[PDB]
Amino acid sequence: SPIFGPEEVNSVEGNSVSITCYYPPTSVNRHTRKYWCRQGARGGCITLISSEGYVSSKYAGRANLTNFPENGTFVVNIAQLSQDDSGRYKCGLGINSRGLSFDVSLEVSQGPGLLNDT
Amino acid sequence: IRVFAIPPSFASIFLTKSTKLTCLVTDLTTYDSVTISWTRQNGEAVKTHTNISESHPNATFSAVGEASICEDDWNSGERFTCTVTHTDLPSPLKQTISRPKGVALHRPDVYLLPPAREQLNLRESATITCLVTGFSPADVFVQWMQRGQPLSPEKYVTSAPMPEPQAPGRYFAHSILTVSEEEWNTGETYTCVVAHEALPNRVTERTVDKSTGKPTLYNVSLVMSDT
Amino acid sequence: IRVFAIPPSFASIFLTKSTKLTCLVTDLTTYDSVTISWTRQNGEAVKTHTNISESHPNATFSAVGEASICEDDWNSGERFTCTVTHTDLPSPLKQTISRPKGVALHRPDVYLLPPAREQLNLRESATITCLVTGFSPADVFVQWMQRGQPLSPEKYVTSAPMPEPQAPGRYFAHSILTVSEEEWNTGETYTCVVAHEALPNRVTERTVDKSTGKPTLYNVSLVMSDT
Amino acid sequence: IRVFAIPPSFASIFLTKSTKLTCLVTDLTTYDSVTISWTRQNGEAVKTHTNISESHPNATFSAVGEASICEDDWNSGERFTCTVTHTDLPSPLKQTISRPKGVALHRPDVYLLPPAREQLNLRESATITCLVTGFSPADVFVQWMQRGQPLSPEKYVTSAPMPEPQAPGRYFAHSILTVSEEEWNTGETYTCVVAHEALPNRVTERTVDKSTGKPTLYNVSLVMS
């Protein structure tokens, strides 16, 4: 509940994206884990990038995560999106099992066009 | 004639605030009139060095070069030079050491694995693996502690840093301890401590006994009164 | 003018099955008139060793000749020598090499340890530690196997043998496999193979999965009341 | 006067590491001045045999050539010949042996099955089956090692490779072991080692224990008022 971020963010494939999530500027939240996880119909966040350094094997080079304790913020940058990335996600801190977190939705769509007449 | 330049650990500093820096030469020839001089990067020499080594029993002859500096100086990161001037090769060899710059700070994540039940069936000895992980820069220090009495290091052995396969920068290390199973069967928890310069108060630690580590048995007996 | 002959090792020979012996030189010049001759005890044939070294950036020369042979014979104890005939010196230069019988033997016993609950708590990446123990001689080897096909030696890291403190120079070592817990939550038995000459079949495995430290029984006692 | 030659069998070479093939000449009459040798693809000189058995019960003559080799030589796809120049045979009998190269490469998948309770109800002796299957060529060699010590072949039995019924040409095999219950509930690691040429390390093994299962169980006690 004390975490705050954007509800839904849309972009199309090949582009970059940058997401910001907020936490109260206390001591621990300036000095503890931040994460970006992805859930599904299987019961559990699978961690994709962490503030401690670990990046998921499927996200190497794709994305990273940075924390600005002075802004009371941490930022998530994703590039090279695809349609396989659209789903439900969560920003959050501390142990993934609890919910000191915030839920994010993500929808990726292909870059349309191909019509020189429009 | 081989020289080890020995920079003090961050741990040695922080537990002494006494940043002695030394350089040892190993298996040279102990003549007398062995001379080594500590100088800064400027060439200017520094305080002297006393209590210097003597001839070893097994011809692996040695000479300790003691020195001192101000801690901020090492934090400033300028090259330090002890140079060997002995008649064996009166050519002055150059031992230049510094502090790297640009290393970020990262914390140890000390887990502590308990001995495998299999080893408990060879029925004599038990082993516990204090672990540190994902930390920068190098040179963590660790020791083991139990029942409020320290454990003289000949019980435990520790690794040194070496990079993670996955983390581009973060090193890790180990420690191993061997104890009679009955001693671990006695209960008799154990605490491994780590000191490292990305840790808030510089020192964290964890513990384990028979009950904490991988118990087959969960015995909660919780009472909830006056709903 | 110093020449070394490289001895095959259980790590090497097991990685090749094809024990091969070669030779290296220090401080020689890089021309023809190179006589690489591998010898039996009394000096039988050398194989057609090809792919020799090239001129070294300091113009030293090292002449290399490999002789892939049968395997038991080196174990059988046949002294082998490396004789050379260079332009810089005419005098023959021969380097004896053989299997060094002597020091006694001690089997290992690999204990595999499953990742700490804490680490799985972070559910970040699971590290499994394979901990070889108290064996002799050195030159252990390990590689990680699951579903029968192996994993790249980059996915894990073992420092070479350390002496053991408590026992005399019986050694130990350890490698750590680190994996996505998001996979170690799935099964994937992930066994760790060990090679050591003292081993009655030369090769042992143990393994573990999640269901290896799982507690057997809960013992809940809920006494909800309003008294 | 009949020439046989037993090729070095992978099971035998494993227990020995001393690869050995022997040419047995059967129903030869008991002459002497008999020249029996072992030769490589170039007829190269071997070391001789030793310890001929006594003359046959049917009063015939058994010629056996025991030669020790390097293991690669037989697996290097290189033929061997054992020659006999008997009295009755005016010529040397050079017969060529070659490993059946071209056979498929199928490693086993050992599933060491644990013993159910029914037998662990007369409290007499557990029975452990080291099922092996899904593999070819034949000559898998299986034996049980205990906590660092071998088990001599009394304690266990195994079948011979029986081809799989429904799966195409291949093989399986059985093996069995017996131990009393107060062992299989006492410790008793009980690993079962499989030696077969298609394993990466050429040797795998598995083990089980009294507690190789027996999943999570609850003593939930729920007193309320």
Side-chain angles (χ1 to χ4, degrees), chain A residues 75-110:
Chain A
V75 56
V76 175
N77 289 279
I78 303 89
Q80 186 173 9
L81 286 68
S82 69
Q83 204 166 353
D84 190 358
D85 298 355
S86 284
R88 310 167 62 73
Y89 291 82
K90 183 177 41 59
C91 53
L93 277 66
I95 293 173
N96 208 338
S97 72
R98 286 89 164 99
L100 181 68
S101 61
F102 183 75
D103 63 352
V104 182
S105 158
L106 263 293
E107 182 62 29
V108 194
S109 58
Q110 73 278 26

Short mmCIF file of all heavy atoms in Angstrom, two decimals, chain A residues 75-110:
data_model
loop_
_atom_site.label_atom_id
_atom_site.label_comp_id
_atom_site.label_asym_id
_atom_site.label_seq_id
_atom_site.Cartn_x
_atom_site.Cartn_y
_atom_site.Cartn_z
N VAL A 75 13.86 3.20 -10.39
CA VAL A 75 13.44 3.29 -11.78
C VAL A 75 13.72 1.98 -12.50
O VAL A 75 14.74 1.33 -12.25
CB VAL A 75 14.14 4.45 -12.50
CG1 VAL A 75 15.63 4.30 -12.39
CG2 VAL A 75 13.72 4.49 -13.95
N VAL A 76 12.80 1.58 -13.37
CA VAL A 76 12.94 0.36 -14.15
C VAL A 76 12.88 0.74 -15.62
O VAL A 76 11.88 1.32 -16.06
CB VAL A 76 11.84 -0.65 -13.81
CG1 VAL A 76 11.95 -1.84 -14.72
CG2 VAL A 76 11.94 -1.05 -12.38
N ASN A 77 13.93 0.41 -16.36
CA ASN A 77 14.02 0.69 -17.79
C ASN A 77 13.94 -0.61 -18.56
O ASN A 77 14.74 -1.51 -18.33
CB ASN A 77 15.33 1.39 -18.12
CG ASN A 77 15.37 2.80 -17.62
OD1 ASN A 77 14.83 3.71 -18.25
ND2 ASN A 77 16.03 3.01 -16.49
N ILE A 78 12.98 -0.71 -19.47
CA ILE A 78 12.87 -1.89 -20.32
C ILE A 78 13.00 -1.42 -21.76
O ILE A 78 12.37 -0.44 -22.16
CB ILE A 78 11.54 -2.64 -20.14
CG1 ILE A 78 11.32 -3.05 -18.69
CG2 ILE A 78 11.50 -3.86 -21.03
CD1 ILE A 78 10.62 -2.00 -17.89
N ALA A 79 13.80 -2.14 -22.53
CA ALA A 79 13.97 -1.86 -23.94
C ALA A 79 13.74 -3.15 -24.71
O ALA A 79 13.74 -4.24 -24.13
CB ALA A 79 15.35 -1.29 -24.25
N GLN A 80 13.53 -3.02 -26.01
CA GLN A 80 13.34 -4.17 -26.88
C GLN A 80 12.14 -5.00 -26.41
O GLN A 80 12.25 -6.17 -26.06
CB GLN A 80 14.62 -5.00 -26.93
CG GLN A 80 14.65 -6.15 -27.90
CD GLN A 80 16.02 -6.77 -27.98
OE1 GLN A 80 16.90 -6.45 -27.19
NE2 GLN A 80 16.21 -7.68 -28.93
N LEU A 81 10.99 -4.35 -26.38
CA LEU A 81 9.78 -5.02 -25.96
C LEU A 81 9.32 -6.01 -27.03
O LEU A 81 9.78 -5.99 -28.17
CB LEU A 81 8.66 -4.02 -25.68
CG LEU A 81 8.70 -3.17 -24.40
CD1 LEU A 81 9.82 -2.15 -24.39
CD2 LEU A 81 7.35 -2.51 -24.18
N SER A 82 8.41 -6.89 -26.64
CA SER A 82 7.82 -7.83 -27.56
C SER A 82 6.41 -8.14 -27.09
O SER A 82 6.01 -7.75 -25.99
CB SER A 82 8.63 -9.12 -27.65
OG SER A 82 8.54 -9.84 -26.44
N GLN A 83 5.66 -8.86 -27.92
CA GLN A 83 4.31 -9.20 -27.50
C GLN A 83 4.30 -10.28 -26.44
O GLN A 83 3.25 -10.53 -25.83
CB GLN A 83 3.49 -9.66 -28.71
CG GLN A 83 2.00 -9.49 -28.51
CD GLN A 83 1.22 -9.61 -29.80
OE1 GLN A 83 1.80 -9.71 -30.88
NE2 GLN A 83 -0.10 -9.61 -29.69
N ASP A 84 5.43 -10.92 -26.19
CA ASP A 84 5.54 -11.93 -25.15
C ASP A 84 5.76 -11.29 -23.79
O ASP A 84 5.92 -11.99 -22.79
CB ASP A 84 6.68 -12.88 -25.51
CG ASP A 84 6.75 -14.12 -24.62
OD1 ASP A 84 5.95 -14.27 -23.68
OD2 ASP A 84 7.64 -14.96 -24.88
N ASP A 85 5.76 -9.97 -23.71
CA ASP A 85 5.99 -9.30 -22.44
C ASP A 85 4.71 -8.74 -21.84
O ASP A 85 4.75 -8.23 -20.72
CB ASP A 85 7.01 -8.18 -22.61
CG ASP A 85 8.36 -8.69 -23.06
OD1 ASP A 85 8.52 -9.93 -23.14
OD2 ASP A 85 9.26 -7.87 -23.32
N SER A 86 3.59 -8.85 -22.54
CA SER A 86 2.34 -8.27 -22.05
C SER A 86 1.71 -9.18 -21.00
O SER A 86 1.39 -10.34 -21.27
CB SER A 86 1.38 -8.07 -23.20
OG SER A 86 1.75 -6.94 -23.97
N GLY A 87 1.54 -8.64 -19.80
CA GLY A 87 0.96 -9.41 -18.72
C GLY A 87 0.89 -8.56 -17.48
O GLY A 87 0.96 -7.33 -17.55
N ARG A 88 0.77 -9.21 -16.33
CA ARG A 88 0.60 -8.49 -15.09
C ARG A 88 1.91 -8.55 -14.32
O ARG A 88 2.55 -9.60 -14.25
CB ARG A 88 -0.52 -9.10 -14.25
CG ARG A 88 -1.81 -9.31 -15.02
CD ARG A 88 -2.78 -10.19 -14.25
NE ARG A 88 -3.17 -9.60 -12.98
CZ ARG A 88 -3.99 -8.56 -12.86
NH1 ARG A 88 -4.52 -8.00 -13.94
NH2 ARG A 88 -4.30 -8.08 -11.67
N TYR A 89 2.29 -7.41 -13.76
CA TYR A 89 3.57 -7.28 -13.09
C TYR A 89 3.39 -6.56 -11.77
O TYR A 89 2.31 -6.09 -11.43
CB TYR A 89 4.54 -6.52 -13.97
CG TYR A 89 4.96 -7.26 -15.20
CD1 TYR A 89 4.17 -7.28 -16.32
CD2 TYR A 89 6.18 -7.91 -15.24
CE1 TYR A 89 4.57 -7.95 -17.44
CE2 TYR A 89 6.59 -8.57 -16.35
CZ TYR A 89 5.78 -8.59 -17.46
OH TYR A 89 6.21 -9.26 -18.57
N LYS A 90 4.48 -6.48 -11.02
CA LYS A 90 4.42 -5.75 -9.76
C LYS A 90 5.77 -5.09 -9.49
O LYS A 90 6.80 -5.76 -9.62
CB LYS A 90 4.00 -6.72 -8.66
CG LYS A 90 3.81 -6.15 -7.29
CD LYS A 90 3.33 -7.20 -6.31
CE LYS A 90 4.00 -8.53 -6.47
NZ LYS A 90 5.47 -8.46 -6.30
N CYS A 91 5.78 -3.81 -9.13
CA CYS A 91 6.95 -3.25 -8.46
C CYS A 91 6.81 -3.52 -6.98
O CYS A 91 5.71 -3.68 -6.46
CB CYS A 91 7.16 -1.76 -8.77
SG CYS A 91 5.86 -0.55 -8.52
N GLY A 92 7.93 -3.54 -6.28
CA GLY A 92 7.85 -3.74 -4.84
C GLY A 92 9.21 -3.79 -4.21
O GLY A 92 10.23 -3.81 -4.90
N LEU A 93 9.20 -3.83 -2.89
CA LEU A 93 10.42 -3.87 -2.12
C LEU A 93 10.42 -5.07 -1.19
O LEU A 93 9.43 -5.78 -1.08
CB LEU A 93 10.57 -2.60 -1.28
CG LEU A 93 11.14 -1.34 -1.90
CD1 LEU A 93 10.23 -0.78 -2.98
CD2 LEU A 93 11.35 -0.33 -0.81
N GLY A 94 11.55 -5.28 -0.54
CA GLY A 94 11.67 -6.32 0.42
C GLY A 94 11.34 -7.67 -0.18
O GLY A 94 11.28 -7.87 -1.39
N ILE A 95 11.12 -8.63 0.73
CA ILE A 95 10.83 -9.99 0.32
C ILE A 95 9.64 -10.00 -0.61
O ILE A 95 8.65 -9.31 -0.40
CB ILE A 95 10.58 -10.86 1.56
CG1 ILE A 95 11.87 -11.00 2.37
CG2 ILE A 95 10.06 -12.20 1.16
CD1 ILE A 95 11.69 -11.71 3.67
N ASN A 96 9.76 -10.77 -1.69
CA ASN A 96 8.70 -10.83 -2.68
C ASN A 96 7.43 -11.42 -2.09
O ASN A 96 6.33 -11.13 -2.58
CB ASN A 96 9.17 -11.64 -3.88
CG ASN A 96 8.50 -11.22 -5.16
OD1 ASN A 96 7.41 -10.64 -5.14
ND2 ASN A 96 9.14 -11.51 -6.28
N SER A 97 7.55 -12.24 -1.05
CA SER A 97 6.40 -13.00 -0.58
C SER A 97 5.36 -12.09 0.04
O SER A 97 4.15 -12.30 -0.14
CB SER A 97 6.83 -14.07 0.42
OG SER A 97 7.19 -13.50 1.66
N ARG A 98 5.79 -11.06 0.75
CA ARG A 98 4.83 -10.11 1.29
C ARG A 98 4.37 -9.20 0.17
O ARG A 98 4.64 -9.43 -1.01
CB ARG A 98 5.42 -9.28 2.42
CG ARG A 98 5.58 -10.00 3.69
CD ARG A 98 6.91 -10.62 3.69
NE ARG A 98 7.28 -11.01 5.03
CZ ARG A 98 7.17 -12.24 5.49
NH1 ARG A 98 6.70 -13.19 4.71
NH2 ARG A 98 7.54 -12.52 6.73
N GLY A 99 3.67 -8.14 0.53
CA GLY A 99 3.11 -7.30 -0.48
C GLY A 99 3.54 -5.86 -0.35
O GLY A 99 2.85 -4.97 -0.85
N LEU A 100 4.70 -5.59 0.25
CA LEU A 100 5.14 -4.21 0.24
C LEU A 100 5.51 -4.01 -1.21
O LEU A 100 6.65 -4.16 -1.64
CB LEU A 100 6.30 -3.91 1.18
CG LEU A 100 6.66 -2.42 1.08
CD1 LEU A 100 5.57 -1.57 1.65
CD2 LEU A 100 7.93 -2.10 1.78
N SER A 101 4.49 -3.70 -1.99
CA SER A 101 4.61 -3.80 -3.42
C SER A 101 3.51 -2.97 -4.05
O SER A 101 2.67 -2.39 -3.37
CB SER A 101 4.55 -5.25 -3.85
OG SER A 101 3.31 -5.81 -3.46
N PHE A 102 3.51 -2.95 -5.37
CA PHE A 102 2.50 -2.26 -6.13
C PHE A 102 2.34 -2.97 -7.46
O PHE A 102 3.33 -3.28 -8.12
CB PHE A 102 2.90 -0.80 -6.33
CG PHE A 102 1.88 0.01 -7.04
CD1 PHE A 102 0.74 0.43 -6.39
CD2 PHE A 102 2.07 0.38 -8.35
CE1 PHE A 102 -0.20 1.19 -7.05
CE2 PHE A 102 1.13 1.14 -9.01
CZ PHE A 102 0.00 1.54 -8.36
N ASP A 103 1.10 -3.17 -7.87
CA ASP A 103 0.83 -3.96 -9.05
C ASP A 103 0.83 -3.08 -10.29
O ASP A 103 0.35 -1.94 -10.27
CB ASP A 103 -0.50 -4.70 -8.93
CG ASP A 103 -1.68 -3.77 -8.81
OD1 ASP A 103 -1.49 -2.55 -8.66
OD2 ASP A 103 -2.82 -4.27 -8.87
N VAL A 104 1.42 -3.60 -11.35
CA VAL A 104 1.54 -2.89 -12.61
C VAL A 104 1.02 -3.80 -13.71
O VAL A 104 1.25 -5.01 -13.68
CB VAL A 104 3.00 -2.49 -12.88
CG1 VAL A 104 3.09 -1.71 -14.17
CG2 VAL A 104 3.56 -1.70 -11.72
N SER A 105 0.33 -3.21 -14.67
CA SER A 105 -0.10 -3.93 -15.86
C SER A 105 0.67 -3.42 -17.07
O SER A 105 0.97 -2.22 -17.17
CB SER A 105 -1.60 -3.77 -16.10
OG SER A 105 -1.93 -4.01 -17.45
N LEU A 106 0.98 -4.33 -17.98
CA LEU A 106 1.78 -4.05 -19.16
C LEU A 106 1.19 -4.71 -20.38
O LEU A 106 0.88 -5.90 -20.37
CB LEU A 106 3.22 -4.56 -19.00
CG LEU A 106 4.38 -3.69 -18.56
CD1 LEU A 106 4.63 -2.70 -19.65
CD2 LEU A 106 4.08 -2.99 -17.27
N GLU A 107 1.06 -3.92 -21.44
CA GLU A 107 0.46 -4.36 -22.68
C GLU A 107 1.40 -3.89 -23.77
O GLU A 107 1.63 -2.68 -23.92
CB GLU A 107 -0.94 -3.77 -22.86
CG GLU A 107 -1.62 -4.25 -24.12
CD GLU A 107 -1.82 -5.74 -24.13
OE1 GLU A 107 -1.97 -6.34 -23.04
OE2 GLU A 107 -1.83 -6.33 -25.23
N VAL A 108 1.91 -4.83 -24.55
CA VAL A 108 2.81 -4.55 -25.66
C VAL A 108 2.11 -4.97 -26.93
O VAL A 108 1.45 -6.01 -26.98
CB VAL A 108 4.15 -5.29 -25.50
CG1 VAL A 108 5.17 -4.73 -26.46
CG2 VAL A 108 4.63 -5.19 -24.07
N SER A 109 2.25 -4.16 -27.97
CA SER A 109 1.60 -4.43 -29.23
C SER A 109 2.59 -4.17 -30.35
O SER A 109 3.56 -3.43 -30.18
CB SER A 109 0.34 -3.58 -29.39
OG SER A 109 0.65 -2.20 -29.31
N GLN A 110 2.36 -4.82 -31.49
CA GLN A 110 3.28 -4.71 -32.60
C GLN A 110 3.18 -3.33 -33.24
O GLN A 110 2.16 -2.65 -33.13
CB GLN A 110 2.98 -5.78 -33.64
CG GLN A 110 1.72 -5.50 -34.43
CD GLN A 110 0.46 -5.93 -33.69
OE1 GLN A 110 0.44 -5.99 -32.46
NE2 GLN A 110 -0.59 -6.23 -34.45
#
